[PDB]
Design a binder for this molecule. Structure first.
Ligand SMILES: CCCCCCCCCCCCO[C@@H]1O[C@H](CO)[C@@H](O[C@H]2O[C@H](CO)[C@@H](O)[C@H](O)[C@H]2O)[C@H](O)[C@H]1O
Ligand SMILES: CCCCCCCCCCCCO[C@@H]1O[C@H](CO)[C@@H](O[C@H]2O[C@H](CO)[C@@H](O)[C@H](O)[C@H]2O)[C@H](O)[C@H]1O
Ligand SMILES: CCCCCCCCCCCCO[C@@H]1O[C@H](CO)[C@@H](O[C@H]2O[C@H](CO)[C@@H](O)[C@H](O)[C@H]2O)[C@H](O)[C@H]1O
Ligand SMILES: CCCCCCCCCCCCO[C@@H]1O[C@H](CO)[C@@H](O[C@H]2O[C@H](CO)[C@@H](O)[C@H](O)[C@H]2O)[C@H](O)[C@H]1O
Ligand SMILES: CCCCCCCCCCCCO[C@@H]1O[C@H](CO)[C@@H](O[C@H]2O[C@H](CO)[C@@H](O)[C@H](O)[C@H]2O)[C@H](O)[C@H]1O
Ligand SMILES: CCCCCCCCCCCCO[C@@H]1O[C@H](CO)[C@@H](O[C@H]2O[C@H](CO)[C@@H](O)[C@H](O)[C@H]2O)[C@H](O)[C@H]1O
Ligand SMILES: CCCCCCCCCCCCO[C@@H]1O[C@H](CO)[C@@H](O[C@H]2O[C@H](CO)[C@@H](O)[C@H](O)[C@H]2O)[C@H](O)[C@H]1O
Ligand SMILES: CCCCCCCCCCCCO[C@@H]1O[C@H](CO)[C@@H](O[C@H]2O[C@H](CO)[C@@H](O)[C@H](O)[C@H]2O)[C@H](O)[C@H]1O
Ligand SMILES: CCCCCCCCCCCCO[C@@H]1O[C@H](CO)[C@@H](O[C@H]2O[C@H](CO)[C@@H](O)[C@H](O)[C@H]2O)[C@H](O)[C@H]1O
Ligand SMILES: CCCCCCCCCCCCO[C@@H]1O[C@H](CO)[C@@H](O[C@H]2O[C@H](CO)[C@@H](O)[C@H](O)[C@H]2O)[C@H](O)[C@H]1O
Ligand SMILES: Nc1ncnc2c1ncn2[C@@H]1O[C@H](COP(=O)(O)OP(=O)(O)NP(=O)(O)O)[C@@H](O)[C@H]1O
Ligand SMILES: Nc1ncnc2c1ncn2[C@@H]1O[C@H](COP(=O)(O)OP(=O)(O)NP(=O)(O)O)[C@@H](O)[C@H]1O
Ligand SMILES: [Mg+2]
Ligand SMILES: [Mg+2]
Lengths: 634, 634
């Protein structure tokens, strides 16, 4: 080995025109190699067929051009990060060689090699100072670009998923299907945030880049393997251990040590899916037991039952803390193997290359590159076993959403009562039988016809099929049969409930509930509030406090007689609606209904024997199935 | 510089008997230095006086010995981690010297220095193989020891905080205080998990050790500074830049560069507290609007109002996504400074020591130790500015709990009605005036006395002070005055509500609600269910489904007449309770009450004019303030 000076590894001049063609070449290969694996994952996979049923309409259509145009920049922002990782490795090959040429000039004595080794050190520091700004600039323009995507995804998904909950009265007929969902108030608010925001377990924090995401963190660990496998191939040598001549030992060793140590870490973390799904189910049945106590806080204070409610509230907190203690005991046997494997491989490229260095074969430059390339194809093939604890919690957020999407298509396939429009203006019903979900009987087939000015009173016992007749004519009860003829329209058939109801907003929205607040003028709302003796509420039409705990139940049944004078229906049904009003105010509220609307089919359910002298006919339920119709004898 | 062989830095023999005395010496200093800073933080701090009001009783008392004994091991588990970080730095000082003595024997020619440098390399690999098992063993016995602490803290805190919510009827009188809390169903379930589990922002995951916690991550960054400052002190030299002779440049430089760059990163992240407090408030008023729609899903289906409810549900989702977009825009200007500062300091110990190395002053061993000690007192003084985004979200979880603890001591200071026990058996009330929170009047002072067999009917209009008389005798209405004399006891004065109520559990718990299910024998519950005509419910006493949506409101008022035959009260009040029952079943339910309990003061509120011929006296509210008392006629 004669006197050789210092020569660089890569020509640092013409390094920017060469790293502008490699990026443009590696982008178009990966753009058609990524789009051929997701097609193979939409089929042939049980968890890939449930990802596409939820969010299909966001990626296809005419309004899905700005989605792919923003998804195509995040691949350039990963290829540009692999290229800098290679150019950082090319510089430590120069610095450790320049630090070796300076030591062989001091001990030898000459000053030609030393002056060529000193000048090679101050060159390989100025290259580090230019490639340290392009790292900060690339990192900080990558947090901002990936937080504008998982916001606009979440805003679309939680708006599309709610129209699917209240489309065909599917929020009420989900109690009769065979397999029922637990609570759909949590899978819309919280679970969409875990589903859309990349890494599983937690909702997103405003510092999550693209390296903490289970898609773009996996397509980096393939380009980082393909781009590094041409450096480790021509830096290893023949190894003899048992008389077997292995040609490239350090390259075939790392592909055996990972494949064996991976398949043991898939049978340890196998039951880790059904322990992270039960942690969201038992934690969302504890919060519902506290909200139900909040809006019923007067009846608990009346009964003084604050000690029985301290037991049915503690019976739901025991299995949410007994399940967590075995979720902890499984994530130590899983995290104790992936660290004990990765720790006993770090002195391996220092004990194979070290006998080849003390003899004159290599020159201390390629030891500092073998120590980097071996610790970078090992940190990229160990992505599929280091991040299995954050994928098994992401697979338990597709099941919860797929249950909600599945249990609304079986909520619109249950049978109901067929409804047809009338001939001119009539309410006639041909044959109706109503059953009980256990299989009993309530009402035999009956035939009723009303005319344009008729009336009807339905009377009977206290617990025999009286409200569930009206729950069948409103298309809400599945166990029924028959047909109905109605004066159909938009709001030309009004129903009223037995227990009163008030919405959330201001009092102007409480007064006219089925219509909007802007479709009713201001000048007509202050006169109809004085016919129902609701005088002192002419102010306070712009307040915000909750009216379910302020308005007494004798004033929530006079508001319900003001929603019937503004909508102007034709065939209004009503049950109850005089449970709190006394006689004198009850008789004064039906004369107004007969004097304002001159021709409406009024059907009213009642209990007190002072309303039968106002209507014309009468239907009586004997209980057990038998009905009896008779005209008002008067 | 003559021929010198290889000598180690530290005597590796007698390294275990020396590192067993240093740990025992550094434990007792830190045990009394840590306990003198927390005392200075309990006072003199606005966020330290609110931490002690919540969780005081857990750390003091006689049952708080096993808390400190488990808190004292987690300090040993940090001192044992600083000592290994020093012993790892002592080994790179040997390996880089042994790699330098081998290169000065090849170029010089002799084989005495080379054979002494080769043998010094294979010694400093076997020391790395022993100190790599004590790292994995220490890390994996540190996850398990800190997950047994923040479980037993959470189980105690969420049980102590709930007894403070329903102690003195404080769940109802929190609506009348001056500054009201938002929703206390979220600060008990979720916010205790963020408060107890160390690092802020997210609830704990089962892999959080002790280095991801805002207390034991701060007491490591002081012992790591004190233990490393004696190595960097005697490795730096005199630097001349502008004619000023600085004695120790590399030590006084790093204490100036951090103190300046810290105080700029405290005025950028200053409004980051009130943006992480509003993210939990606007996200917990959206979920409440979905639960209220779930248990009232019949009245929305009757009215067909699924389009007005799609607007009052979208008016609460706009400000939860408009606030997040400015939480993202602040966490980039804060994270863009702490990375741009820490990146431009990494080539600094390589450009000051490099002219001193090419001349014969140092020997390449202490460059590899200056590169480590400078990058370890810089990574420990930068703990108070790198982790300010996770502390400003922890300071917004003490305000939410302190509001809940504060708003229950002002909920028991409001005035009420004084109650005294009776003389023998009587209900007499002296003077009672009842007001309205706006300042109006409902009831003038009145004086009523009942005897051991008397009765009373309270009648009046539909909206004039009828239920709020009974909301004052039950100690629930703050705007009242006067006194009351009652036959006091445990359950010798029963109240009933206007709207019925059913608890959560099985039907055996629904039937006997104020008593427990075990305090009533089985043989007496099946006879009293047949006197109230509730015959077919003799089975299904062991089911689980919700009975608020199954039992009709005509059968939730006959169950309420079976809670009055098992408790056996003396002076029972009741309002409503016959809104759905017809005549014939109403008259048959009062004869049973008079025939089973032979002497009870029965006070009943009613509307229908067929109940006044059963009682004896009568009180009538004229409306506006005037009352009128008269004995029952014929
Ligand atoms: C599209 C983005 C591309 C991503 C990858 C980024 C590639 C660019 C990063 C490395 C740039 C290296 O920048 C380097 O600077 C040093 C000076 O400090 C210069 O280095 C060169 O200087 C002069 C030419 O000017 C030569 O005679 C000399 O032999 C050589 O040392 C070159 O200008 C360039 O080789
Ligand atoms: C940063 C967070 C992570 C981001 C997550 C990004 C996920 C992107 C996944 C897209 C993968 C492509 O998904 C693939 O799209 C093509 C269209 O090009 C579909 O091809 C076709 O699908 C069905 C097949 O019946 C057709 O009805 C549809 O018209 C058509 O799109 C494939 O069915 C789908 O599997
Ligand atoms: C992570 C993968 C990154 C590689 C992909 C980057 C794309 C770079 C160019 C962006 C242009 C995207 O533009 C988009 O292309 C896809 C083809 O896939 C077209 O096709 C897409 O929509 C059409 C309907 O419009 C569907 O029938 C089809 O199933 C769907 O794949 C879109 O109509 C077009 O809007
Ligand atoms: C999810 C799967 C995604 C698949 C991703 C596939 C990425 C492909 C890696 C880049 C391939 C580029 O192919 C390469 O191009 C450059 C420019 O000529 C040349 O090779 C260049 O990159 C390779 C890295 O592979 C270097 O080892 C080599 O020093 C360099 O000159 C060769 O011609 C060819 O090996
Ligand atoms: C429609 C396209 C859907 C793409 C949505 C985005 C997902 C991005 C890819 C997920 C990354 C997971 O990374 C790795 O994936 C492979 C499968 O490829 C999983 O490997 C396994 O997954 C599960 C869990 O055992 C097995 O049922 C499956 O048979 C096997 O493929 C690894 O457990 C996971 O660590
Ligand atoms: C309480 C826990 C303490 C925490 C800190 C941990 C301290 C222990 C870690 C370092 C232990 C070093 O272990 C080291 O092993 C090498 C062999 O490989 C030995 O090293 C020594 O060997 C023999 C003595 O046996 C000597 O003549 C020789 O000069 C020297 O190289 C010593 O046995 C010990 O110095
Ligand atoms: C891993 C998660 C993080 C773990 C968090 C650990 C926090 C531990 C904090 C404890 C600090 C000591 O806190 C200090 O205790 C001493 C008792 O020794 C108290 O000293 C005294 O406090 C008040 C003073 O009026 C007395 O009523 C009380 O009897 C007494 O304890 C101090 O008031 C308190 O400030
Ligand atoms: C993070 C700090 C770690 C350093 C502390 C490690 C302690 C090592 C020995 C553990 C013994 C602890 O034992 C505990 O000591 C404290 C003194 O602080 C005593 O004092 C504690 O409780 C008593 C009442 O019992 C209170 O009046 C007092 O305010 C409180 O500090 C406890 O009564 C005792 O149970
Ligand atoms: C929240 C605040 C907590 C404060 C924590 C305070 C920790 C104190 C650090 C350890 C102090 C030990 O004090 C030290 O003891 C050992 C054993 O003799 C000796 O010094 C030993 O440790 C020091 C580290 O400081 C080394 O630089 C030295 O090589 C070693 O011999 C000296 O005598 C004395 O400097
Ligand atoms: C009763 C004992 C309470 C101990 C509970 C456990 C808390 C553990 C210590 C908190 C760690 C925070 O670490 C660092 O603390 C210092 C104060 O010491 C904070 O410094 C500042 O805090 C806030 C925020 O500006 C200022 O109002 C305060 O004036 C100042 O001290 C830093 O913002 C924080 O990064
Ligand atoms: N915060 C409030 N809580 C209760 N009532 C309030 C409140 N603010 C104002 N009020 C009025 O106070 C009165 C109390 O009504 P209340 O005496 O309970 O009715 P009632 O006579 O029991 N009704 P009814 O059941 O129909 O016979 C009503 O006029 C309310 O509108
Ligand atoms: N899932 C169910 N939903 C409704 N009713 C059910 C259900 N399962 C059983 N039933 C019984 O079916 C009957 C329906 O009661 P319903 O006809 O609504 O009462 P009502 O006659 O309106 N009562 P009332 O208001 O006092 O006059 C009752 O006997 C219920 O106990
Ligand atoms: Mg009914
Ligand atoms: Mg009332």
């Amino acid at each position: 080995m004669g006197p050789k000076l210092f020569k660089p590894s890569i020509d640092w001049s013409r390094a920017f025109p060469d790293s502008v063609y490699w990026v443009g070449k590696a982008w178009t290969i990966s753009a058609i190699c990524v789009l051929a694996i997701l097609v193979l994952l939409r089929y042939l996979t049980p968890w890939g067929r449930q990802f596409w049923r939820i969010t299909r309409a966001y990626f296809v259509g005419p309004n899905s051009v700005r989605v792919w145009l923003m998804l195509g920049v995040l691949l350039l922002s990963v290829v540009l990060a692999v290229r800098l990782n290679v150019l950082f490795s090319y510089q430590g090959n120069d610095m450790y060689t320049a630090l070796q040429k300076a030591f062989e000039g001091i001990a030898s004595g000459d000053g030609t090699v030393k002056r060529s080794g000193v000048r090679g050190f101050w060159m390989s520091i100025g290259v580090f100072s230019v490639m340290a700004v392009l790292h900060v600039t690339r990192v900080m323009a990558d947090i901002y670009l990936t937080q504008r995507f998982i916001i606009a995804w979440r805003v679309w998904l939680t708006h599309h998923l709610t129209q699917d909950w209240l489309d065909g009265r599917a929020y009420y007929r989900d109690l009769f299907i065979d397999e029922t969902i637990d609570n759909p108030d949590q899978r819309i608010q919280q679970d969409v945030d875990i589903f859309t925001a990349g890494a599983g377990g937690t909702p997103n924090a405003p510092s999550n880049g693209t390296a903490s995401t289970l898609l773009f963190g996996a397509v980096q660990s393939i380009i980082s393997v393909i781009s590094f496998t041409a450096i480790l191939w021509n830096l290893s040598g023949t190894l003899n251990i048992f008389g077997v001549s292995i040609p490239r030992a350090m390259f075939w060793t790392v592909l055996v040590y990972v494949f064996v140590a991976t398949v043991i870490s898939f049978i340890i973390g196998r039951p880790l899916i059904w322990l992270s799904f039960r942690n969201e189910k038992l934690n969302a049945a504890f919060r519902y037991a506290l909200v139900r106590l909040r809006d019923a806080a007067e009846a608990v204070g009346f009964y003084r039952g604050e000690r029985v409610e301290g037991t049915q509230l503690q019976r739901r907190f025991t299995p949410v803390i007994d399940n967590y203690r075995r979720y902890v005991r499984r994530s130590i046997a899983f995290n104790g193997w992936n660290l004990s494997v990765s720790q006993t491989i770090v002195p391996l490229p220092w004990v194979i290359q070290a006998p080849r260095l003390f003899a004159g074969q290599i020159d201390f430059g390629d030891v500092g590159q073998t120590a980097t390339s071996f610790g970078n194809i090992h940190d990229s093939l160990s992505f599929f076993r280091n991040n299995y604890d954050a994928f098994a919690s992401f697979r338990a957020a597709i099941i919860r959403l797929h249950g909600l999407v599945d249990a609304n298509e079986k909520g619109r396939a249950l049978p109901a009562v067929l409804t047809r429009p009338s001939d001119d203006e009539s309410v006639e019903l041909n044959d109706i039988e109503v059953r009980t979900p256990a299989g009993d009987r309530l009402i035999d087939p009956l035939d009723v016809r009303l005319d344009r000015g008729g009336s009807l009173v339905i009377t009977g016992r206290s617990g025999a099929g009286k409200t569930t007749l009206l729950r069948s004519l409103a298309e809400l009860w599945p166990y029924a049969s028959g047909t109905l003829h109605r004066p159909g329209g938009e709001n030309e058939t009004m129903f009223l409930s037995q227990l009163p109801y008030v919405p959330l907003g201001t009092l102007r929205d409480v007064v006219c509930y089925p219509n909007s607040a802007a479709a009713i003028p201001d000048a007509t709302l202050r006169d109809t509030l004085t016919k129902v003796a609701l005088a002192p509420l002419c102010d306070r039409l712009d307040e915000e406090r909750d009216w379910a705990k302020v308005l007494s139940p004798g004033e929530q049944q006079r508001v319900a007689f003001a929603r019937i004078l503004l909508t102007k229906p034709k065939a209004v049904f009503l049950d109850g609606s005089t449970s709190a009003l006394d006689t004198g105010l009850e008789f004064a509220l039906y004369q107004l209904l007969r004097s304002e609307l001159p021709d409406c089919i009024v059907i009213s359910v009642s209990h007190r024997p002072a309303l039968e002298r106002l209507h014309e006919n009468q239907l009586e339920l004997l209980g057990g199935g038998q009905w009896r119709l008779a005209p008002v004898e008067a």
